[PDB]
């Protein structure tokens, strides 16, 4: 009777309210996301324009569906050739389900050891950046479509990720638990992975401001609404 997106929201609320019952609830939530299709959200797949992106439009947009104190639920829509740059989710669980298109998701974690003095990167770092670089581990980098299962991240594993739209636009549904809360110490930090002068392998990470060419704007969510 209830729409699939309402059932997902309900199950997310039960799951994220590890306490007893959490794994069975998380498994049921993943099984619901595995069934989700773009049409269940009234989102038609978007295909490439083959035109350059003008400076006034954002590379990525976001449709909000619902949020509680326990989780946030929405859809990111990436235009051709865009990314959500490498970022973390402090103390946070996250799920992602591709709705259309193909994304490449690179998954890493922060490992603190000092950079060895002889160590060298290309492009070279400024002195303040050499002091700030920290070790990380690159755990996976694979492509996902709507036929893949959901991708999961936790506070302790795969907590850093980068999402690239592959050969055209792509969109995914995300669940984040708890949501970000900058006033409470849970913000979104961006990072650069540095190339010195396969998986899992050790890398070097540099926290960095949000890129000048990345931002995300809201757009209306067209699908069935989540009701209290």
């Amino acid at each position: 009777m209830a729409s699939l997106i309402q059932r997902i929201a309900r199950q997310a609320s039960l799951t994220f309210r590890m306490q007893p019952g959490f794994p069975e609830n998380l498994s049921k939530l993943k099984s619901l996301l595995t069934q989700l299709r773009a049409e269940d959200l009234n989102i038609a797949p978007r295909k490439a324009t083959l035109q350059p992106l003008p400076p006034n439009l954002p590379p990525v947009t976001y449709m909000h569906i619902y949020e509680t104190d326990g989780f946030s639920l929405g859809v990111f829509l990436l235009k051709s050739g865009t990314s959500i740059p490498l970022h973390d989710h402090p103390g946070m669980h996250g799920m992602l389900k591709v709705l259309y298109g193909t994304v490449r998701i690179s998954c890493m974690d922060k490992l603190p050891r000092a950079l060895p003095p002889e160590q060298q990167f290309e492009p070279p770092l400024q002195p303040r950046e050499r002091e700030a670089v920290r070790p990380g581990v690159l755990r996976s980098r694979a492509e996902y479509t709507e036929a893949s299962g959901p991708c999961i991240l936790t506070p302790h594993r795969d907590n850093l990720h980068q999402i690239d739209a592959v050969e055209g636009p792509a969109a995914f549904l995300d669940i984040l638990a708890p949501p970000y809360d900058p006033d409470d110490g849970r913000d979104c930090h961006y990072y650069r992975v540095l190339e010195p002068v396969d998986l899992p392998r050790e890398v070097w990470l540099l926290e960095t401001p949000q890129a000048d060419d990345f931002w995300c704007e809201g757009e209306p969510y067209p699908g069935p609404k989540v009701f209290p």
Partner: peptide, 14 residues
Amino acid sequence: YIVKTFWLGSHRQC
């Protein structure tokens, strides 16, 4: 401008 969002934290929305 900076907006505090549930989905991307402190986000520069421009």
